[PDB]
Design a protein around this motif. Structure first.
Motif, short mmCIF file in Angstrom:
data_model
loop_
_atom_site.label_atom_id
_atom_site.label_comp_id
_atom_site.label_asym_id
_atom_site.label_seq_id
_atom_site.Cartn_x
_atom_site.Cartn_y
_atom_site.Cartn_z
N UNK A 103 135.77 -14.23 85.93
CA UNK A 103 135.01 -13.28 85.11
C UNK A 103 135.49 -11.84 85.26
N UNK A 104 135.96 -11.48 86.45
CA UNK A 104 136.39 -10.08 86.66
C UNK A 104 137.60 -9.67 85.86
N UNK A 105 138.27 -10.64 85.20
CA UNK A 105 139.31 -10.28 84.25
C UNK A 105 138.78 -9.29 83.23
N UNK A 106 137.48 -9.36 82.90
CA UNK A 106 136.88 -8.50 81.90
C UNK A 106 137.06 -7.02 82.27
N UNK A 107 137.22 -6.73 83.57
CA UNK A 107 137.36 -5.33 83.99
C UNK A 107 138.60 -4.71 83.37
N UNK A 108 139.58 -5.56 83.04
CA UNK A 108 140.81 -5.03 82.42
C UNK A 108 140.56 -4.38 81.05
N UNK A 109 139.65 -4.98 80.27
CA UNK A 109 139.45 -4.50 78.90
C UNK A 109 138.19 -3.69 78.67
#
Ligand SMILES: [Cs+]
Ligand SMILES: [Cs+]
Ligand SMILES: [Cs+]
Length: 138
Positions: free
Chosen positions: A107-113
């Motif tokens: 879920x922390x991939x979202x921090x990229x966008x």
């Protein structure tokens, strides 16, 4: 302007939604199981996410098992049409923001966008720390 293709029964999707909110915006929520993207929308999402069609396929669900999708006998467009016809095959969550589109697994991939920083510490629902109060990724 943020959109999340969300499955409320999926922990990864719940954590991603709460991180979006913790950046200070309330996204449009699309319950893709009932309201899947159109074919052109799905084709675009996949292009923007920079992953293969197959990388988007959710395994361990009834159509994946029964249509034999584990086997390498399907073109990308065959796989896209199965996704449209059987939306549980679309892995989740997909998030769209002005900065781009990601399959937010983990879920922390979202921090990229997310354009704005988390507004305070973020801990996943199972207690896994993600960012501390200072804003550092743990
Ligand atoms: Cs749609
Ligand atoms: Cs960012
Ligand atoms: Cs977990």
């Amino acid at each position: 302007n943020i959109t999340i293709y969300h499955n409320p029964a999926c922990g990864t999707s719940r954590n991603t939604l709460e991180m979006i909110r913790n950046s200070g915006t309330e996204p449009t929520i699309i319950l893709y199981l009932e309201n899947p993207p159109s074919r052109d929308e799905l084709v675009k999402l996949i292009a923007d996410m920079g992953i293969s069609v197959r990388a988007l396929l959710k395994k361990n669900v009834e159509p994946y098992e029964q249509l034999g999708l584990a086997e390498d006998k399907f073109t990308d467009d065959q796989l896209i049409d199965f996704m449209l016809q059987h939306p549980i095959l679309i892995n989740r969550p997909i998030v769209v923001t002005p900065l781009g589109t990601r399959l937010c697994r983990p879920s922390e991939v979202v921090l990229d966008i997310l354009q704005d920083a988390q507004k305070g510490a973020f801990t996943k629902e199972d207690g896994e720390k993600v960012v501390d109060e200072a804003g550092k990724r743990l």
